[PDB]
């Protein structure tokens, strides 16, 4: 069960938040902290909605459910799962483009700003609800890069 909408409002609204946080905070980096905390709060609520509206075990499957189901169900896309770790510890999510971006732009004076940092909190918060303590973070952003990459690593069970 899941109702749909166009990206416009969502990306537009998110751009509003980011643009405002840049005013309520004089430091590009304290914005990141807030965006993550905020993402965390959503991730905590999201996991529930998600779980209820569909059908993990080990970390390799979790990556699948995340990039093939979750990411597709909410943000309407499907990142690629590449660059794993010898013991199913760490992986990477690839995107031919930034999911929270389109037509809403901020004056560029923000070099240390991670525009879509909120996604990292969402992931951490969501997983943390399914008894999983992990870590998310960007390592490529469509920042003059070829593609968007989010690195994630299973830290410990709960």
């Amino acid at each position: 069960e899941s109702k749909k909408m166009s990206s416009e409002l969502f990306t537009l609204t998110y751009g509003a938040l980011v643009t405002q946080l840049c005013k309520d905070y004089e430091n590009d980096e304290d914005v990141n902290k807030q965006l993550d905390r905020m993402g965390y709060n959503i991730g905590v609520r999201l996991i529930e909605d998600f779980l209820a509206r569909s059908n993990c075990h080990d970390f390799r499957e979790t990556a699948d459910v995340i990039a093939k189901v979750a990411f597709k169900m909410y943000l309407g896309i499907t990142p690629s799962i590449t660059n794993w770790s010898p013991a199913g510890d760490e992986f990477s999510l690839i995107l031919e483009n930034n999911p929270l971006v389109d037509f809403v732009e901020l004056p560029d004076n923000h070099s240390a700003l991670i525009y879509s940092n909120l996604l990292c909190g969402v992931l951490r918060g969501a997983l943390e609800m399914v008894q999983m303590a992990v870590e998310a973070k960007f390592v490529q952003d469509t920042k003059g890069d070829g593609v968007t990459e989010i690195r994630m690593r299973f830290i410990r069970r709960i």
């Binding site: 109702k3 909408m5 416009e8 509003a16 709060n41 909410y74």
Partner: protein, 157 residues
């Protein structure tokens, strides 16, 4: 690449933004003002994208034309539908209304909240306000309940 997002992406995001604003505010009235602020911050971006994409790059200079841009172009782009009603106050030549039958937020949540608010309307009103002023029409946009949720649009004399 035109995308389709879950009605939840927005709902969840907006809900946090509301909480954010509420954490640094004293009253609901102030909460809505902050939301309207966030809205005004991006109204212009939406104005330019819709003009260049749906109006051959020509902005509006007449009142009726810009109001229709709001009711049709802007409302569709944001909520997938046209605004329910566009009216002029019969009492004064400088006031207009965008009347929605249901609160804007209800289309993004499984079950409408027991108690209604004007948070999405305030935010939206700020967007509509940036759109109007940035097109050359100095105005004041407010929100309230009357025949559903209303966006009051008042042009400066």
């Amino acid at each position: 690449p035109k995308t389709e997002v879950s009605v939840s992406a927005f709902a969840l995001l907006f809900s946090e933004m509301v909480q954010y604003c509420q954490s640094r505010v004293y009253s609901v009235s102030e909460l809505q003002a902050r939301l309207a602020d966030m809205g005004q911050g991006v109204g212009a971006s939406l104005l330019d994208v819709l003009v260049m994409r749906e109006k051959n790059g020509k902005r509006e200079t007449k009142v009726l034309n810009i109001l229709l841009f709001i009711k049709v172009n802007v409302w569709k782009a944001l909520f997938g539908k046209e605004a329910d009603k566009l009216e002029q106050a019969n009492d004064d030549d400088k006031t207009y209304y965008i009347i929605e039958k249901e609160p804007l937020i209800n289309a993004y949540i499984s079950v409408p909240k027991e108690n209604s608010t004007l948070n999405c309307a305030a935010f939206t009103g700020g967007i509509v306000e940036a759109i109007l002023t940035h097109s050359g029409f100095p105005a004041k946009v407010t929100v309230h309940w009357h025949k559903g949720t209303t966006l009051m649009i008042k042009f400066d004399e």
